[PDB]
Amino acid sequence: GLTHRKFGGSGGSPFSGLSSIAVRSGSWLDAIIIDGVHHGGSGGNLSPTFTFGSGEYISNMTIRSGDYIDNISFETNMGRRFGPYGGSGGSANTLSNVKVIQINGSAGDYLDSLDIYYEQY
Amino acid sequence: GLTHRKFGGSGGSPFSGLSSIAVRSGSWLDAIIIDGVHHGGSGGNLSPTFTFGSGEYISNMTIRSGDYIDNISFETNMGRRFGPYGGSGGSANTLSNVKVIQINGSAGDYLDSLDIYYEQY
Ligand SMILES: OC[C@H]1O[C@H](O)[C@@H](O)[C@@H](O)[C@@H]1O
Ligand SMILES: OC[C@H]1O[C@H](O)[C@@H](O)[C@@H](O)[C@@H]1O
């Protein structure tokens, strides 16, 4: 039963807990770095860090994956892009016309899985 | 429509994009710090940073709020606790038997509001 609730008032500027993304990747994903927090191992190469602007969110996302995450790319509502980073194995799946709220997952020395929470438009 | 999708396999240790929380607070909340990213102003006192364990999430949460956020406390599924931090004003609202996925909000010099995304069990 996924849902959300607002608390408090109407002032201020909006912000998101999903502030920046980087990855370590080779032929698959070694790690995802979320808001500077490292999730995964130390292999592969480190990508640049994508920092979302105010009012910017992931609107499209392509993940190549098998038993492990092989490739990530995304696009934002402002027309900016991240990736593709990773390899060409696994199967591709796309989220289209979304707003990504959160990225959880599972990682060891490599990135096993991602759980993407989002609104579908 | 709020939903989620899983990509990848079953290995590794679970993690969350929402990996640590701290606040600045006096009589109300000046800021919330999510994964080290500062959201709000410089007033009040800095709380310690709660860092979630793998597979640990907010299961219960009490927020005191009015037109601004007044107080935050939460408990995790592992029995650990954060807060209460803040003042005693506003009205209290509780999320019970949940799994918090994301904390967004709105802030200027203080914490105006929070948008809490969560699973309701
Ligand atoms: O991504 C998995 C693996 O792919 C490549 O072989 C290299 O870049 C490694 O360092 C990396 O760990
Ligand atoms: O909480 C709002 C306000 O409360 C108190 O008066 C002080 O601790 C301030 O520094 C703080 O900004």
From Swiss-Prot, chains A, B:
GO terms for molecular function: carbohydrate binding; D-glucose binding; D-mannose binding; identical protein binding; N-acetylgalactosamine binding. Coiled coil: none annotated. InterPro entries: Jacalin-like_lectin_dom, Jacalin-like_lectin_dom_sf. Keywords: Lectin, Mannose-binding. SMART domains: Jacalin. Pfam families: Jacalin. Residues 2-120 form the Jacalin-type lectin domain. Mixed specificity lectin with anti-HIV activity. Binds to HIV envelope glycoproteins, including exterior membrane glycoprotein gp120, and inhibits viral entry into cells. Binding to gp120 is dependent on gp120 being glycosylated, and is inhibited by mannose, glucose and N-acetylglucosamine. This is Griffithsin.
